[PDB]
Design a protein around this ligand. Sequence first.
Ligand code: NA
Ligand code: NA
Ligand code: NA
Ligand code: NA
Lengths: 806, 803
Amino acid sequence: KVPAMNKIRLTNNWEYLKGDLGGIWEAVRPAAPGSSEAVPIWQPVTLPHCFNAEDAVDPDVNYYEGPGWYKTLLAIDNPYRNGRIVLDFDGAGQKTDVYVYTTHVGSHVGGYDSWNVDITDAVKAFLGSKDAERFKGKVPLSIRCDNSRDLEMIPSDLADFNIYGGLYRYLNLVYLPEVSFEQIHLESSLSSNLKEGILKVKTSFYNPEDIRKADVTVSVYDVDRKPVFSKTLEGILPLGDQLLAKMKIKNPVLWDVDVPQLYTCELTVKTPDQTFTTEERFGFRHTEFKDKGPFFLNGKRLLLRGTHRHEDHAGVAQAMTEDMMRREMRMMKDMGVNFIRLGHYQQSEIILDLCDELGILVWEEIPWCRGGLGGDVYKKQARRMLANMIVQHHNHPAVIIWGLGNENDWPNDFNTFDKSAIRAFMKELHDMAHRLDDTRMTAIRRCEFCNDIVDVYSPSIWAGWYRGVFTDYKSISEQEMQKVKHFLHVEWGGDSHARRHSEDAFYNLKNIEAGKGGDERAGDASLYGGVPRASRDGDWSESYVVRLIDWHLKEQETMPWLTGTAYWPFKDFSTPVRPDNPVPYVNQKGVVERDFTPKESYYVFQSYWTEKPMIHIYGHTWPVRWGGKDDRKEILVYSNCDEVELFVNGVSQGVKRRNSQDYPAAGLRWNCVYQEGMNEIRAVGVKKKEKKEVSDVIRQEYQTAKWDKEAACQVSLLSEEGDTALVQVQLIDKNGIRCLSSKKQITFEIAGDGSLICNLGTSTGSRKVQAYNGRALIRIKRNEGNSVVAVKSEGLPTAFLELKSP
Amino acid sequence: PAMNKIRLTNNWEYLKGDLGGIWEAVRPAAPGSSEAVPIWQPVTLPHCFNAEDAVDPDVNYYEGPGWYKTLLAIDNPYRNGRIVLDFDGAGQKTDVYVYTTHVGSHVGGYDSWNVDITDAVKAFLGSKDAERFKGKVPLSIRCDNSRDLEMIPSDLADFNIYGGLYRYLNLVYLPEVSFEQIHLESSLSSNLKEGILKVKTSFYNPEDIRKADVTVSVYDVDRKPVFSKTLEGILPLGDQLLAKMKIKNPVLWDVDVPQLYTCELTVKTPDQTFTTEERFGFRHTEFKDKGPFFLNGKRLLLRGTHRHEDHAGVAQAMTEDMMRREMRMMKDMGVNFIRLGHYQQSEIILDLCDELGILVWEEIPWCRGGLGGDVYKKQARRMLANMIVQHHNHPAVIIWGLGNENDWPNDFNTFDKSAIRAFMKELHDMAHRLDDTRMTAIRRCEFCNDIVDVYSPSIWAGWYRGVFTDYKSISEQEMQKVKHFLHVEWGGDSHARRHSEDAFYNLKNIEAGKGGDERAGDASLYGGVPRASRDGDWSESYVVRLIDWHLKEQETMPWLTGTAYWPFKDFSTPVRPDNPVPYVNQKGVVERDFTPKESYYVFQSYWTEKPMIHIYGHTWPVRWGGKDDRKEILVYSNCDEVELFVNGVSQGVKRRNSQDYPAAGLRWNCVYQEGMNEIRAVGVKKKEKKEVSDVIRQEYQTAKWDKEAACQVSLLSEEGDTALVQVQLIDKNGIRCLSSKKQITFEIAGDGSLICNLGTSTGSRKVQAYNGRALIRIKRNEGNSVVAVKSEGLPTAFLELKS
Ligand code: NA
Ligand code: NA
Ligand code: NA
Ligand code: NA
C-alpha cells in the first residue's frame, strides 16, 4: 500500500528462467553442482526485468509469450514489532503466481495494475520448519510470470504492442507495523468561483492483529509545505473504513499545467507499540468539457497538447527504471506537452506522480483493446482492472479521463462478433466508473456503435497517413466533432525511420485523393492491399512527417472549439505485428527514438508549444543533401523565436519573421545555394518577450553526382569511444557514387571477441535495418579484443571490416 | 406491476424428498407404473414443508430437499417480451428447471430474487418434447432446507429454518425494455422544510434498444402529482439518473400520520408503453449520543415488538390477508416500532409498516454459531446487499441489522472473536457504502459493541435472569456502555388461558441485583440458576405484571430510545420440545392463530388513546381461595377513571395513574361469592368524552384439591361439523385441580380428526393443562369417533363423538 522509508525495491540477487518448472519443488529443492538438479541453468538478472528485452525487436523470431520463473533468497528482518511483510507489485505481466518456499501465497491476472501479497504467515511457517536450515536464514521467494497468448484475457494479441512478460515494474518489500493504511482516498472538490476547496480524507485500515484503538493524526500541508490543517482523532477504531477528516480550504492554491502545485496529506497512526506515518499528495483543480465545445481548466480554455506513451524502451522492453521514466517525462514537458493518454493500459505510478509534478493532464484506460468480447473470466478481468485503476490512481490531480477501451470494433479474437453485447458491457464499465468516481469523464477511442455511451469520444483520424491527405485534417475534425457531445482527438501522426531524409517528401504521394476521409480501416495498417496512402506509398522519411506535424499544429491555432489532440506516440516502441518495418518490429511514429534520441519532429512540437527560446535547423541527422549544381535548396528552421536570420557558409540569407500560418516552418524557411562539398548552416534567433538570442548550427555535405543502382557496401570505422566502435555502411553504385535514396536492407554480423550493440529497436541499434539515405550505422562493444564484422545486402557482395583493440 | 405480475398459486404438486435427477420430474409416467411413485401431494402456494411437523410433538421438523412441479400456460402479451419468475422468498437453497434445463439457483431463504426464463421457454416450445405437454411448459423447482453449518442462519437459532415456496412466486411478463432497479434517494433539510429526491434506475434491455422516452412522475399521499418530467430519447441501458428535485415543505412521514409519496416511471418505445412505481417517504431520524431517539425533531419513545414469519396451520406460508390482519393488530395495540425477527421479511410486511406507521429494524440472519468459511461469508454479504438494495426505499426502515447473538458459539470447533470483529466491520462498512442514511445495529455481542452505530445488549429481567424490578437499573448501566443504546428483546412466556392466584409463588430462589442478561444455559428448562423462565408457572398472570412494570418504568426513562418486546405472536421453534405447547415460543401477547392473550390489552392500555377497558381474566373461568378472601382484580384501561362493579355492587371509582403499580391504579380487592360472579368495569375518557365498559363472569372455588386422580372428558360445545372437547383434571374426591400443569395427550380413532398441530394451547394433541383444563376441537367429518385422553399415571379416559 502507501508507506515511506519501509519500502525496499528488490532489484539485486535474482535469477530468471525462461520456461516453466515441473512444480514449485524444482525451484527450492537441494541441488549439488553437476547434478541433474543443476539444469536448467538460470540467468542472473537485476530487476525490473522483461522476458522480451531482446526478442521483441529481434528480426528473426516471434517474441516469447509463455511462462517464466524468478527466484531469490529474501533477507527478512522486519524493523517493526509484530510487523507485517508485504510484497507490493507495481506491475507484472501477465498472470503471476507467488510462492514462499513450497506454499502458493498469491496470484494475479492483469499486467498493468498494482497488487500485493501479505506473506507474514507463510514466512513464519517456513522459518519454523526443519527445511529452513538449508537456506541459511533467508526465505526462498519464487515467482512465476506468464504472458502466454490467451483469447480470454485482455489485452488482445491483435493489438499493436507487445503483451510483455515478467517482473517488469518494481517489486517492493514493504515492512508494516501492526496497524497501517490499506487505502487512502483524498476526495477534493473546488467551488464554483474556485475560492473554496473541500477535502474529505477517507481510509481503509489494515489491522490483521485486531488492535482495538489507535490515535490517528491527519495533517495537510500547502504547496510550500506549511501546515494548514491538523486534527488528531483519539481512540478511533482502526479497522475497515473510516472517514478521518472533512475540511474546507479558502483560497486554495490551484493545480495547473503551467504551475503544478500540490497539497500533501500526512496521516499518522499511533498505538503504544507504533508510530506510523505516510503521506499522499493531491491537487485542487476544476475541469470542464463544453458541449460541442472545447476544454476548460480552472475556468479558462486550454487546448490539450497531447502525446501518448507505451511502457517500452531500448534494451529493456517494459522494464524501465525510475531514472528512465523521469528523463522521458521531462523530455515530454520540455516539448510543451500538457496532456497524455497513457497508451492502452494503467501505467506505473511513477509516471502518474511525474504527471502531477510536471503539469500533464492524463487519460488512462484499461487494456480492452481490439478483438471483440470474451466470456465471464474476460469480463471479470476488465471490471477488476477498471476498478483497480480508478481506486489506485483516484488521488492524482493530473487524471481527467478514465478510458474504457480502444478499437473495440476490431473483430476476430472469437468466431462471433456481437455489437449489442459489446454495448452492454461498455455501458456496465461506464456505469462502474461513474459509480466509483463521478468527478472524471469516461472515454473510448474508435467504436462508433458505442459513441453514445461514454462521456468523451475519439474517432480515428489519421489524415495524411493511413488515409487521405493531411491538409484535410481540419475539415475532418470539424465533421467529426459534430457527431458527439465531447470530442477529443487521440492518435494521429506518421512513421519516420530516424535519420532518413528526402529532398522530395511527396515524390510518390502526388496522387493521393483528398476529400474521402482520414480514418484507419481494416487493412490500412498492413503493408499490402488497399488504396493509395502515405502509410503504404510514402518514403517514411522524417521529411514527410515534419511537414505533416507542422500542418496539424498550425491548423490547431485556428480551431477555437477544439478540446485538443494527442499525437501517437511520443517515442518509438516495439510491436509484434510489424515485422517488415524499416526497423523490424518497431512502430516508428515517435518523435523520439526508442533510446531517447530526439527525432527532427520533436523540435516541430517544441517550436509551437513552448515559450523558452529555442531554434532548430531541420537536418541535424541529414549528412548529405543532393541536387543540381547551384540549385536553391529549401532550408526549414523550427523555432519559437520572433525573427530568425539564416547564414550559409557565413553569408547572411536574410531575416525572416515567425508566422505560424505561413506554412511551412511558420515562415522560417529559405532557399539557398549549397556548395558541392561541405556547408555550414547557422541560424540566429531572437525572442522579444524574453529579450534572448539563441543559435543553432549544422554541417551538411552537398552531392551533385547522380547515382545508379546499389552495387556494393563500403564499410568503415567512423569513430570510437572507449571500448565501443561505431561502424558505418554506405551503399554505392558501380562507379562508387553514394546511393543517397537507397532504402535497401542491410544485415550486420560479427565473429570474434566483440558483440553487436543490436536489438535496441533503433535505426542505429539494429542488426537488420533498412538504409537511411544509403547508409547504416551500428555500434560494436569490442570487449577489449579483436573481431571481424560482416555486412550483407541482398544481391550485393558481402563486405568485411576488422576491429582491433589497442 | 399488478397488470404484468401473476401469483402462481394453483395447480402445483409437492414431493417431500429428493428426486434422482430432473428427468424424474418430467418423464412420461403411466398409471400403475414404477414412474408413478413416489406419490406427490397437490398443494396451493404459498406452501411450507413444515406446516405440520414444526409443532408436531413427536418428530424433528424436516430439514431436507423437496420438489414442486406445475404446468405453465404461457402467453406473453408483449411483442418480443421477457418471461420472468419472481420469487418473494423460498427456503433455503432453490434450483429452478424449465423442462430438463436448469435455469436458476439461489441460496438464501429470505431475500427476493428472479429468473429470466424467456430463452428456455422458447427452446422448449420449439422442441419435439413440447407436444406431450399439450401447449403447457413444465416448471419444476427444488427447495432444500437441509442443515448446513456453512449457511446462515444457524440451526442453533430459536426459530425453524423453514423449507419450501413459502412466499409468493410470481410470473412476470415484461416488454423489451423495463426497469431492473428503481432507487429513490430522499433527504430532509435541517428545518424539515426542504426535501431532496434523486430518482435513479437500472434498465433491463436485452434487445439493446438504443433510445426510449422515459417519464418520471411523483405523487403525494392522494396520488396527485407534485412533479412530472419526460426525458426524450434517453439511452435505456444500464444506470441512468432520471431526476433530481427539491420539494419545498414536503409532507413528512410519521408514526401517527404515515404519509407516502409515489414515484411512477414509464418507458416508451414505438413498440411498448411500460409503467411501474415505487413508494418512499420524507422523514428525519436522529439517535442522540447517550440519549434518546428523535423523529422529525421530536423525541419519540420507540414502542416496539418483533415478529417471525410463522403462523398456525401454515408455518412460514402466510398469505397477504394474514399479514395484513397481523400488522393491523399491532398498530391497534400502539406499536410504532418493529424488529423483523432475524431476517429480511416479505415486502408485503415492509409496505404495511410504511402504511401503518411502524418504524423498522431489519437484519440478516447471521444468528448464532460463530463464523464460517468463504461460502458462508459470501452469503452474508450477498444477503446484506440484497436486503438494503431491495428495501432501501421504505421510509419505515431506520436500522439495518448485521446479526444476533454472534457471541453464541459451537457451530464450529473454533471461535475467533477477532475474525468475527473483522467480518462484522466489513458488513458495517458495506451497509454504509450502500446506504449512509440509516444506522447499523447488532444484538448481544459485547466484543463487537464498538463496531455498529446502534447496540442492543441482552436484558431479559424477570425472565431469563433476575427480577423484573431490576429492569430500569440494568438498562441504566447498559446504556452507558455504548453511544446509541436500543433495547431489543424482553418479555416472558405465558401458556395462553393459564392463570394463577399467586403469580410469584415458586419464585423464591431468584436473586436480584446480579444482571438480567440471558447467558448460556438460561434458555434451557434444565440446570442453571433459579430464574422465572425455569421456575415460573408460565401463567399469563405473571407476564401481565412483568409487562405492566416495564411499561410504567419506561415513562420515567427520558434518555431511552425505546424497546421492542419479543415477540408479538407465539411462533414455532425447534429447540423447545418441552414447552407447555411443544415446539412453540410462547412469549407472544397474541397466540399463533391471532387470538389475543390478556397481555395484549396491557400494551394497548399504555400505548393507545382510543378508549378501551379490559378486566384481567377473560380466559380465567374459575378463581379460587378461601371463603371471604379479598381477591385482587386488575383492570387495564387508558380511561381517566374506572368504576368497578362486582355482582352489581359498586366497589368505588379509581383514577388511572401509571406509576401506581400494578394496573396503573385501576385495581380493587373484592370478595367473590362461592359460585358464579359477574365483574363489570365502566371507564370514562375525558378527552374523548366517551364511556366504555367491559364485563366478565368467573366462578369462585373454595374447595381445596388433592393430587390429580382422573381426567373428566366432556363435549363442551358443537358448531356444525366441529366439536369442542374439554378435559378437566380432578382429584380422588372429584374436586377440580385448578393449579395442575399436567400434560394431556389426545388421540382419536374413527371418522373424525383432531384439529391439532396449530401451535396453540387449544390446538395441540399434546399440551400442558391450563388450571387443570385442556380443550381441543375435533372435525367430526359427519361420522363417529372415540377420543382417548391420556395423562401419565392416570387412567385413560374416553369420549364417544357421534354425528
Ligand atoms: Na521479434
Ligand atoms: Na489476450
Ligand atoms: Na416438531
Ligand atoms: Na445453517
